[PDB]
């Protein structure tokens, strides 16, 4: 709008003033400088809006993906929805956009232990089903990887495969049998 008040080479920026004090033969040679100028001012506006409307169409395609995958589900993609492990998300509507409240799970209060790839019992290597082998200085436990919940080592949380010679770092420890003590 602010560029409707520019000569663009003409004598004036008002079509009424040019038509009033110019003859028809040489009024047209001053209107064309405004026709060309105001046309070029509308093309550079439409062109930048075509580019600007393709930026929004990429955020409106990312917002529809974040709604389908994080609001209508639980996402495994890293840093897609929040900084942490995704739990759930809530949409809130803003005037010309959307706001996502990403509920995540952040671990905290970590303490360090001593691990072993396997545990050699009865001459057989034992690997855990789900979790890790950890030692609190003296005793060995099987705990889940994302939360310290140690458990004694039995044949229900470990699976045996191979011998004790091939693994590098296998330790000697007992794997308690859940049913032998209660036999008869």
């Amino acid at each position: 709008v602010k560029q409707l008040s520019s000569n663009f080479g003409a004598i004036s920026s008002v079509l009424n003033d040019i038509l009033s004090r110019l003859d028809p033969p040489e009024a047209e040679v001053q209107i064309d400088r405004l026709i060309t100028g105001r046309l070029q001012s509308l093309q550079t506006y439409v062109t930048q809006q075509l580019i600007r409307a393709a930026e929004i169409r990429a955020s409106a395609n990312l917002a529809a993906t974040k709604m389908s995958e994080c609001v209508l589900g639980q996402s495994k993609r890293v840093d897609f929805c929040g900084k942490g492990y995704h739990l759930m998300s809530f949409p809130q509507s803003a005037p010309h956009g959307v706001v996502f409240l990403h509920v995540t799970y952040v671990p905290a209060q970590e303490k360090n232990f001593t691990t072993a790839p396997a545990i050699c019992h009865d001459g057989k290597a034992h690997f855990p089903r789900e979790g890790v082998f950890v030692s609190n200085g003296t005793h060995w436990f099987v705990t889940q990887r994302n939360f310290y919940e140690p458990q004694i080592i039995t044949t229900d949380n470990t699976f045996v495969s191979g011998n004790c010679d091939v693994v590098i770092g296998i330790v000697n420890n007992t794997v308690y049998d859940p049913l032998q003590p209660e036999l008869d």
Binding site: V103, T104, V106, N112, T115, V132, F147
Partner: protein, 74 residues
């Protein structure tokens, strides 16, 4: 001449007048360019931005760190 002085300092992006150089490193407040940032801490100061707090995980071939709590972040 909008106002050449005594705090003349030469940057790679240009050369900066009115801000003093300090040998510390802070988080970037106002980006100047080529790793130089400026901030107000009282006079204007110009330093080299700090990427982040230094850290060194205590790696060992038989040690793991397992969290004992958690936190819910929105």
């Amino acid at each position: 001449a909008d106002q050449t002085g005594s705090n003349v300092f030469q940057t790679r992006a240009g050369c900066l007048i009115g801000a003093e150089h300090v040998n510390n490193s802070y988080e970037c407040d106002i980006p100047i360019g080529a790793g130089i940032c400026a901030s107000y801490q009282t006079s204007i100061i110009a330093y080299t931005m700090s990427l982040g707090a230094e850290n060194s995980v205590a790696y060992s071939n038989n040690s793991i760190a397992i969290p004992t709590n958690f936190t819910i972040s929105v």
